[PDB]
Design a protein around this ligand. Structure first.
Ligand SMILES: *[B]([O])([O])[C]([C][C]([C])[C])[N]C(=O)C1=[C]N([C]2[C][C][C][C][C]2)N=N1
Lengths: 242, 225, 231, 219, 238, 226, 204, 199, 236
């Protein structure tokens, strides 16, 4: 038994957690996920990996999951691991609503999931979840928000951020193009396309290679929708002329 | 890689032997039992000048008639100290009387080898139990192997070998508490790397009729002269 | 259930995993605490000062109750767990003793939890160190420091995290009674100490002061800038 | 409730009334009491209505799993063993009184299963509050090896006796004919009763009802 | 390393841990069992490792039931545990079915219990072998042997321990099928004296037990005076 | 049992046990799935080692419900476990909602079970890939669930031996207006490209899914198509 | 009885391509009235409502646990629940407490999400369904409601006539019941719109 | 319910009535209360129908497994012990007396009464609600050395006398004769039952 | 033939996608040195197995590889003896339980599948090794007639017309391959001949074991030394 134990939750000689770092390596090669916060909403733009011609389309999306009435998330890393965490997020949100009869504040939902992730890195002997997430949501305390969390159990709030393939280069572009408090959903969508065009290495951006979701407030209610091919195609056209 | 309960070729438990090694890196503690009572002195071993000397507690009260000096991994000692306090209070509740020094030491010792894969390893600490019961002043010593024994004079910690030699050359059956207190401080000063003042050491006594008493700064200075 | 012994004794009498946990603390952000007359000063290196970050979401300085604050260094995810365990402890203590906990009482609870994770099957030790401050029921200032092994000590002034030695070495020669005489003088000692390791000292340092019967009063960019300006 | 079954020359006929009552008030005038267990096995339920419904659903589900694994047609004896072993476990608290009928490899089989878990294999049975009336018709006119039409008429007369004699039964007669070849579910095989035509009537105009507030929400 | 665990098969399809446990049995002293017409006789060459030990110390002949005797070889502590398992099995059978457990069924139960310690890394295979002898009017004389792997068989004559091969040759010369317990006791004693080594393992005590028509189906130690004749006869033989 | 994971992350960020499970799937017998306009076809090569085997004793195409069928590529005994678990999941869903479980819902639950075996203590991942077909709300579905627990919706796909060529063949032969009968023909042809010698009605299994339900094609029926 | 401790009445009526659900608004403990605007009808979709009568505490608990379950269902399945599926979901929820039941008898009313076919049903406290083609009632004045519904209900009623029918049925029924009343709320569910009306009722 | 079993040289005769009752209503007038636990071992049921049926099935299962493990036909005493064990363990919950009768090669024909967890071997046993009315009859009519034919006649008479007097008994008389040769079933219908003083 | 980590010690996947421990379990079946052959007739099923008892002090009657699972189901074990006994004990229990809960006798193929499923668990869990044995089952099914099933250490099971297991398994498969491509006497003679030909041995009555089930007499039966002799003389 001791001879086969891989010892996933122990400190290495230089105080590092190897399994957590190795899981971060996996997230770095996965599809690009970017989140941008604007004055009138938030958006999620993710590169699609499933692009084969014989693939069928019948779900809400591929990398964007609705968590509750006012929150959505995007994942990067192990697909099957993401399904487990996304289902857990939904339960946490519903449990909060059952108890207080109010939608769970965005940051509280992220923190609850990060607690589960941290637990895997400290005890149990299991390998950690190889997922990084981006959260977009609206709540009555802070309005429109954007969060990013990783396998170690750490999370942070952002105005614009990126995870996955070439996220370091995507973050650089965002720093020089994002205008604090002067961004709009239309202007955020253009930036997303611009950033996505650079990080991705396939010349023509293509509407079939991406998925975009926006979160806005309409008549006192949150509206989350995935942009259709037409709208996405038009956005790509704009960049060409841009 | 072996398990925590692996025996060595010479008949010893590796982990218990490694825990005894940890006791050697700890501060020196001295215990002396005489006819008038028992005194416990421990070197505070303050690491820096910005550190508050009062926060360091190497000598504690288990009960009114029993004192305890620790050496080694201080954090592990707290678990045992609390256990001992609970034992004596439980004994008081059940039998309406005080627990003897030997009994308390026995109860604390029974938690030494209780580890496996619940403690995952043995405690890295050595204890000195001093107090007064029906048999008079009593000094007991317990180590990581669960072995406990009554002693007349005992030193534990980093400089225990040197301290023991002095102790056995200057200890007799008739010596009073005053001599013990002075003798124990003399040896402490000789094996202490730093200078022995009234803020860098700890002293406590327990005599027949008097409760566990931790010497104050003023009382140490008087004796230190 | 995973019951493997993770923290065991090494041949020299050391606890390998505990020493590895201390290595993790060394890579953490520098935190500095200093005792004052009637206010405690806590200075933490903000480091990550990105322009796309929501600063409020990643605070190192936290409140444990209405009378006790704390700073940490090392694994940030481990820190969040310990902070929340202490919060529950403070609530429990107010419902069974009908009185707020003292600074040492919460430090003891936190230190005891850290020690428990160095002698328990199936788990590694917490990879953090904490600086705890505040004032007791009467009104005296306290500064405690716990580490991964579970040992805690009271200090006049202390530093933790990366380059803690350097800030500790410099703290001995600069800590006095005149230096911690006035409230605005307690903010001067900290900053200088932080400046010995914090790159581009100024907007890379977070600040917080705990006063008498006053809530976590975090300082602001311009508030801190004043002191930086003069200095 | 009146439920009844008989074994005839080529198969099984099950019967039931369609009245569901809450104490002394009719709640449902068309409750379906003959339930599918498997393609060639049906069940009539009496007793506690929520227990019957759950018990038969659980059994049908387990019997479908069984037949997916074995790859064969389920036996009536298996249904009786699953049902009776479940009911005995609950010591009568699950108040399901059932008539189980079906045709398998060994031929037609009829069983009565009672709430505590006891069972009996018989050529004709009746259950429910109208059971004595139906049983009197069977005792008086049952013969072994009847033809399909004679058995259908006999079972209808037995259910009808319960419908007219027992205040807990009413409505229509439903039947289920099971043979080696097919299953004929005849929901509403006979309709012996009906609401009267009604002489005059009542009419409410436009704003007969006074309204305090109104919100319209378009979809 | 393919021989560190019982849950690991080696490349040529062997469980080396089970085979290592069999080596322990081969280091032990010899014990033989002979089935005749009237019952079963057990004989053990109990080595006296010290003069300080009392006579009858570390016995290798057990009573697992009123009508069942057990002769063991190998690790005595492992064997004592197996004897307790067998006793409990016999007692359990009497409680559930109301009568004396048949020997074959008892041998099956114990063997499967033994077999359970040869599949995992969590436990290690038992280091002993044992024989089970019994006699009843209905079943007659029965003799079974179970080894560390868990395999059990019925025998006419059996031997376990270091000199199991030499003892077997001696046992084959006898015609136990038509013999009776009384005359077989002397023969068993004789064989043990022949296979006993003098150069090595000096000084041994002979243990004898039997069950059959002569003891009315009760397994017991052979009466001292009857064992005297056997010891005398065996000494003269060799 | 062991409480630690057997599948861990390597230095480059991979989970080698899952990759090794995929190698077992890739060396398995070829399986094809084609979604037509009014149905789905599941075809698999079932070549026995000898004529001693009873062809009609074991099947590779299995029904989960009346409207859901399954097929696999990889380790047969692992496949049996999942089939039994899928049937159980479908019945649990039916007990609660009183309606046949939608194909997508069943795939998600089966994939979740497979994901569990890549993280749970003392176990290896399943060495099988599944092809699930179904008909819900007047529409056909085709899903693929692999060892990691990931699942994809396909129009047409192939797994097992020579799956890469099979997929390329399908891309140059599949169209959206295809019919079930036409889909069945191109499904058998796909298997023929990687087949060894002589495709009969005893060495191949075909399952179909339409509005009537899911059913395994009888050998007589398969002979006619061949 | 535990079912008359708080009072209350709910009824659902089927019309021509539409459904109606109504309830009393009184919340009271035994003889004493506490409030006159207690909610008994909860939305469970665009064109799907559930009415709960019985013990007030269980009315709120059942509605909340059902909302919890329905929300999770909609996220996982990515679609709106069917009226009949909701009935099964509710029955399953009530049957779980077979021995220690929730004291409430739910009434479901709605139109199917794709075909807009009217659907109504009523369950008991144990979870036994009663799908009907005309109407369903639940509460302390069920006998009075049955009387009103049996003689007033007509097949193929349009939204206006259906409103009048259910309104008169509830008004006259709750007026003969001591612990039910203090206002009546009515929901008319059509394919394109939801109309909610509060009726002028007796407050004694 | 009336059940009876008699031992004879070479086997046993066991019989019972066919009435299942629920108060004053006859729910089953032709029920078979004689149930086989094994090839040559039978048990008569009395008391609660559900309890007796469940116990009989549990025992049949345990005996079947036991027989395949021991590679031989189970003894009658073993079957009685298994029934006794279940009956004693659940005495507080079970309300059924399972009378055991059969044949084995070691002890021949044996009859065991196992009511309430107590096991007793008898030359003849009677049970059920109707058995109280025939105690006097069996004590005066029973003779040692009876043949199987006489045993069958003795059993039929006793059951018939009980059926006439006991409201809970009636219908037909089921009869089984067990020997080394096998099991012989027999049904005495209502119009073929022994007639005694009736008016 | 690539390997990595602990793939040759526990049941985890190797780089090629193989399970070495399961493959080693197949080699453990051949350690006993015996061969078994099962043949399905038109209305019967016959199992023949080598009976080697060269110890001489052993009680011949207790040395057997033929077992009765239920009244109508027989089986022959090949491989590690103790592993076989536990598998036989498990099969007996599974059959008894099936009858108890479903009210009818377990079909041969259902029993084989149940045993195969239990074997599969050992190939997926690391803490326990697979059994080093093989089980062949025979019996009469009401509709399908005579059945012959076999399951191995991998958890794979199948129905056969004729099959074999053990040391000379491959040659038995070949021998029967031609023959298959039968009355009770013909089925029995075919089985004995296959075993004799692949082992190059002129069998004697006490050197083989025979088990049968027929449509006329479904009960699993073991032939006596005299019954086997009659067939042996007819083959000679
Ligand atoms: B007898 O009267 O004792 C008889 C013997 C049984 C069949 C073993 N018992 C009963 O008459 C009898 C009837 N019931 C139930 C009554 C309620 C309806 C179901 C049957 N239980 N035992």
């Amino acid at each position: 038994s001791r001879r086969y134990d891989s010892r996933t939750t122990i400190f290495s000689p230089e105080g590092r957690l190897y399994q957590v770092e190795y899981a971060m390596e996996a997230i770095g090669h996965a599809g690009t996920c970017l989140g941008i916060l604007a004055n009138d909403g938030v958006l999620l733009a993710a590169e699609r990996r499933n692009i084969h011609k014989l693939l069928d389309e019948v779900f809400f999306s591929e990398k964007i999951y609705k968590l509750n009435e006012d929150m959505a998330c995007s994942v990067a890393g192990i697909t099957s691991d993401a399904n487990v965490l996304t289902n857990e997020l939904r339960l946490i949100a519903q449990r909060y609503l059952l108890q207080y009869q109010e939608p769970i504040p965005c940051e509280q939902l992220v923190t609850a999931l990060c607690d589960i992730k941290q637990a895997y890195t400290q005890f149990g002997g299991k390998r950690p979840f190889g997922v990084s997430l981006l959260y977009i949501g609206w709540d009555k305390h802070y309005g429109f928000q954007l969060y990013q969390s990783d396998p170690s159990g750490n999370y942070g709030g952002w105005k614009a951020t990126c995870i996955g393939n070439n996220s370091a280069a995507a973050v650089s572009m965002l720093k020089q193009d994002y205008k604090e408090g002067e961004m709009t959903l239309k202007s955020a969508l253009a930036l997303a396309i611009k950033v996505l065009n650079k990080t991705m290495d396939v010349s023509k951006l293509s509407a079939e290679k991406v998925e975009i979701a926006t979160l806005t407030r309409e008549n006192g209610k949150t509206v989350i929708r995935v942009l259709k091919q037409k709208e996405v195609e038009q956005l790509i056209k704009n960049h060409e002329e841009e | 890689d072996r398990g925590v309960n692996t025996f060595s070729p010479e008949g010893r438990l590796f982990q218990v032997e490694y825990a005894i090694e940890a006791i050697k890196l700890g501060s020196t503690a001295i215990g002396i039992q005489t006819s008038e009572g028992v005194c416990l002195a421990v070197e505070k071993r303050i690491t820096s000048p910005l550190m508050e000397p009062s926060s360091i507690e190497k000598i504690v009260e288990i009960d009114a008639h029993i004192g305890c000096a620790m050496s080694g991994l201080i954090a592990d000692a707290k678990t045992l100290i609390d256990k001992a306090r609970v034992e004596t209070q439980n004994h008081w509740f059940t039998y309406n009387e005080t627990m003897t020094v030997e009994s308390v030491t026995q109860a604390v010792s029974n938690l030494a080898l209780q580890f496996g894969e619940a403690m995952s390893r043995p405690f890295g600490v050595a204890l000195l139990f001093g107090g007064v019961d029906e048999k008079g002043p009593q000094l007991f010593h317990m180590d990581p192997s669960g072995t406990f024994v009554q002693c007349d004079a005992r030193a534990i910690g980093s400089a225990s070998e040197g301290a023991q030699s002095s102790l056995q050359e200057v200890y007799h059956k008739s010596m009073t508490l005053k001599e013990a207190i002075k003798s124990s401080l003399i040896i402490l000063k000789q094996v202490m790397e730093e200078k022995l003042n009234a803020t860098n050491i700890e002293l406590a006594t327990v005599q027949p009729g008097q409760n566990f008493h931790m010497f104050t700064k003023e009382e140490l200075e008087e004796v230190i002269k | 259930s995973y019951d493997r012994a993770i923290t065991v004794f090494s041949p020299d009498g050391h606890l390998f995993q505990v020493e590895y946990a201390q290595e993790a603390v060394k890579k953490g952000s520098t935190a500095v605490g200093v005792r004052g007359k009637d206010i405690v000063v806590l200075g933490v290196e903000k480091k990550s000062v990105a322009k796309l970050q929501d600063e409020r979401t990643v605070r190192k300085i936290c409140a444990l109750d209405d009378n006790v604050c704390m700073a940490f260094a090392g694994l940030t995810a481990d820190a969040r767990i310990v902070i929340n365990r202490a919060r529950v402890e403070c609530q429990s203590h107010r419902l069974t003793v009908e009185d707020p906990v003292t600074v040492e009482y919460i430090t003891r609870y936190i230190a005891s939890l850290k020690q428990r994770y160095t002698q328990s099957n199936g788990r590694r030790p917490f990879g953090i160190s904490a600086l705890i401050v505040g004032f007791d029921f009467d009104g005296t200032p306290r500064l405690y420091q716990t580490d991964p092994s579970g040992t805690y000590h009271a200090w006049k002034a202390n530093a933790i995290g990366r380059g803690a030695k350097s800030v500790r070495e410099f703290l001995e020669k600069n800590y006095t009674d005149e230096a911690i005489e006035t409230d605005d003088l307690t903010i001067k000692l900290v900053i200088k100490a932080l400046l010995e390791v914090v790159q581009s000292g100024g907007k890379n340092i977070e600040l917080a002061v705990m006063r008498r019967d006053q809530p976590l009063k975090i300082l602001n960019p311009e508030e801190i800038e004043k002191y930086v300006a003069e200095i | 409730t009146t439920i009844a079954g008989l074994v005839f020359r080529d198969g099984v006929i099950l019967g039931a009334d369609t009245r569901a009552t809450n104490d002394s008030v009719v709640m449902d005038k068309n409750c379906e009491k003959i339930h599918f267990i498997a393609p060639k096995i049906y069940c009539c339920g009496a007793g506690v209505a929520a227990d019957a419904e759950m018990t038969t659903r659980m059994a049908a589900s387990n019997m479908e799993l069984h037949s997916l694994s074995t790859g064969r047609e389920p036996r009536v004896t298996t249904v009786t063993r699953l049902l009776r072993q479940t009911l005995f476990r609950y010591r009568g608290h699950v108040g399901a009184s059932l008539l189980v009928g079906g045709v398998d490899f060994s031929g037609p089989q009829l069983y009565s299963v009672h709430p505590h878990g006891s069972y009996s294999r018989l050529p004709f049975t009746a259950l429910g509050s109208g059971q004595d009336a139906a049983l009197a018709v069977l005792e008086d006119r049952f013969q072994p090896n009847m033809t399909l039409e004679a058995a259908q008429e006999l079972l209808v007369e037995a259910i009808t006796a319960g419908i007219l004699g027992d205040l807990g039964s009413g409505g229509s007669v439903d039947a289920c004919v099971i043979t080696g070849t097919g299953a004929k579910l005849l929901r509403t095989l006979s309709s012996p009763t009906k609401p009267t035509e009604r002489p005059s009537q009542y009419y409410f105009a436009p704003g007969t009802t006074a309204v305090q507030s109104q919100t319209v929400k378009p979809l | 390393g393919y021989d560190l665990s019982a849950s690991t098969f080696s490349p040529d399809g062997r469980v080396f841990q089970v085979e290592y446990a069999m080596k322990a049995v081969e280091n032990s002293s010899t014990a033989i069992g002979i089935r005749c017409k009237d019952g079963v006789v057990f004989g053990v060459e109990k080595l006296v490792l010290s003069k300080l030990y009392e006579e009858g110390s570390n016995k290798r002949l057990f009573n697992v039931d009123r009508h069942v005797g057990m002769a063991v070889a190998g690790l005595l502590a492992d064997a004592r545990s197996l004897a307790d398992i067998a006793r409990e099995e016999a007692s359990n059978f009497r409680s559930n079915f109301g009568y004396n457990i048949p020997l074959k069924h008892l041998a099956d139960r114990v063997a499967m219990y033994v077999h359970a310690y040869t599949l995992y890394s969590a436990v290690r295979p038992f280091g002993c072998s044992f024989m089970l002898g019994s006699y009843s009017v209905n079943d007659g004389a029965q003799l079974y042997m179970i080894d560390p792997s868990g395999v059990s068989y019925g025998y006419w004559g059996c031997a376990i321990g270091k000199a199991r091969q030499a003892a077997k040759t001696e046992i084959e010369k006898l015609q136990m099928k038509e013999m009776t317990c009384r005359d077989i006791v002397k023969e068993v004693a004789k064989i043990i004296y022949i296979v006993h080594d003098e150069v090595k393992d000096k000084a041994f005590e002979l243990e004898l037990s039997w069950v059959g028509e002569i003891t009315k189906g009760r397994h017991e130690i052979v009466p001292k005076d009857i064992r005297e004749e056997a010891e005398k006869y065996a000494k003269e033989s060799l | 049992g062991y409480s630690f994971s057997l599948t861990t992350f390597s230095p480059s960020g991979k989970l080698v046990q899952i990759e090794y499970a995929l190698a077992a799937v890739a060396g398995g017998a070829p399986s094809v799935g084609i979604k037509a306009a009014n149905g789905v076809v599941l075809a698999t090569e079932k070549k026995q080692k000898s004529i001693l085997y009873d062809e009609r004793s074991v099947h590779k195409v299995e029904p989960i419900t009346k409207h859901i069928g399954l097929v696999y590529s990889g380790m047969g005994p692992d496949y049996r476990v999942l089939v039994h678990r899928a049937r159980k999941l479908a019945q649990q869903y039916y007990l609660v909602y009183q309606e046949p479980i939608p194909t997508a819902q069943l795939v998600q639950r089966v994939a979740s079970v497979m994901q569990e075996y890549t993280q749970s203590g003392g176990v290896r991942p399943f060495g099988v890939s599944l092809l699930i077909c179904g008909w819900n709300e007047g529409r056909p579905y085709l899903f693929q669930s692999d060892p990691s627990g990931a699942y994809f919706a396909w129009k047409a796909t192939a797994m097992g031996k020579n799956y890469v060529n099979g997929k390329t063949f399908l891309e140059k032969r599949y169209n959206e207006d295809l019919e079930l009968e036409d889909a069945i023909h191109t499904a058998i042809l796909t298997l023929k490209e990687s087949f060894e010698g002589q495709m009969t009605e005893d060495n191949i299994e075909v399952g179909i899914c339409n509005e009537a339900g899911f059913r395994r094609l009888t050998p007589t029926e398969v002979k006619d198509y061949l | 009885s535990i079912m008359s401790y708080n009072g209350g009445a709910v009824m659902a009526m089927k019309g021509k391509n539409c459904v109606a659900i109504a309830a009393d608004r009184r919340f009271g403990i035994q003889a004493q009235m506490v409030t006159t605007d207690f909610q008994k009808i909860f939305p469970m979709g665009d064109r799907l409502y559930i009415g709960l009568a019985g013990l007030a505490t269980d009315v709120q608990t059942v509605a909340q646990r059902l909302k919890f379950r329905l929300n999770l269902y909609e996220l996982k399945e990515g679609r709106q629940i069917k009226p009949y599926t909701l009935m099964s979901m509710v029955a399953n929820l009530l049957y779980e407490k077979r021995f220690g039941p929730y004291y409430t008898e739910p009434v479901i009313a709605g139109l199917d999400p794709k075909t807009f076919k009217p659907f109504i049903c009523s369950l008991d406290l144990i979870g036994c369904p009663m799908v009907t083609d005309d109407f369903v009632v639940s509460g302390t004045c069920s006998e009075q409601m049955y009387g009103m519904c049996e003689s007033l209900w007509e097949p193929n009623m349009d939204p206006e006539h259906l409103f009048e029918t259910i309104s008169q049925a509830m008004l006259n029924a709750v007026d003969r019941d001591a612990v039910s009343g203090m206002g009546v709320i009515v929901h008319i569910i059509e394919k394109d719109k939801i109309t909610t009306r509060t009726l002028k009722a007796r407050m004694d | 319910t009336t059940i009876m079993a008699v031992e004879f040289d070479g086997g046993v005769v066991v019989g019972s009535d066919s009435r299942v009752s629920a108060g004053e209503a006859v729910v089953n007038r032709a029920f078979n209360k004689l149930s086989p636990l094994h090839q040559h071992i039978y048990c008569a049921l009395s008391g609660s129908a559900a309890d007796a049926q469940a116990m009989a099935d549990m025992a049949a299962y345990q005996l079947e497994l036991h027989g395949l493990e021991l590679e031989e036909p189970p003894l009658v005493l073993a079957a009685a012990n298994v029934v006794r064990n279940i009956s004693y363990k659940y005495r507080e919950d079970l309300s059924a007396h399972l009378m055991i009768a059969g044949w084995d090669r070691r002890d021949g024909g044996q009859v065991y009464g196992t009511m309430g967890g107590m096991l007793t071997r008898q030359p003849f046993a009677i049970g059920g609600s109707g058995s109280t009315y025939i105690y006097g009859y069996v004590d005066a009519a029973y003779k040692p050395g009876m043949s199987p034919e006489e045993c069958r006649s003795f059993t039929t008479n006793a059951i018939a006398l009980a059926m006439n007097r006991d409201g809970s008994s009636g219908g037909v008389i089921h009869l089984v004769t067990i020997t080394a040769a096998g099991v012989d079933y027999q049904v005495i219908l209502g119009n073929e039952l022994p007639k005694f003083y009736d008016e | 033939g690539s390997s990595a980590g602990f793939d040759r010690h526990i049941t985890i996947f190797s780089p090629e996608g193989r399970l070495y421990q399961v493959e080693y379990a197949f080699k453990a079946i051949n350690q006993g040195g015996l061969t078994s052959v099962a043949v399905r007739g038109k209305d019967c099923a016959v199992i023949v197995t080598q009976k080697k008892v060269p110890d001489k002090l052993l009680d011949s009657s207790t040395v057997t590889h033929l077992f009765k699972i239920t009244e109508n189901i027989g089986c022959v074990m090949t491989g590690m003896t103790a592993d076989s006994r536990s598998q036989v004990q498990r099969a007996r229990y599974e059959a008894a339980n099936w009858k108890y809960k479903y009210g009818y006798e377990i079909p041969v193929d259902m029993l084989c599948k149940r045993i195969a499923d239990i074997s599969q668990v050992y190939t997926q869990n690391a803490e326990m090794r697979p059994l080093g044995c093989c089980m062949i089952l025979i019996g009469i099914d009401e509709e399908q007639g005579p059945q012959v099933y076999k399951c191995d250490p991998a958890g794979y099971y199948c129905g056969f017309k004729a099959t074999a297991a053990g040391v000379k398994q491959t040659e038995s498969t070949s021998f029967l391959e031609k023959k298959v491509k039968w009355t009770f006497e013909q089925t029995v003679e075919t089985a004995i001949t296959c075993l004799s030909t692949v082992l190059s041995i002129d069998f004697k009555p006490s050197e083989i074991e025979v088990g049968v089930v027929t449509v006329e007499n479904p009960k699993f039966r073991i032939l006596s030394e005299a019954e086997i002799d009659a067939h042996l003389v007819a083959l000679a």
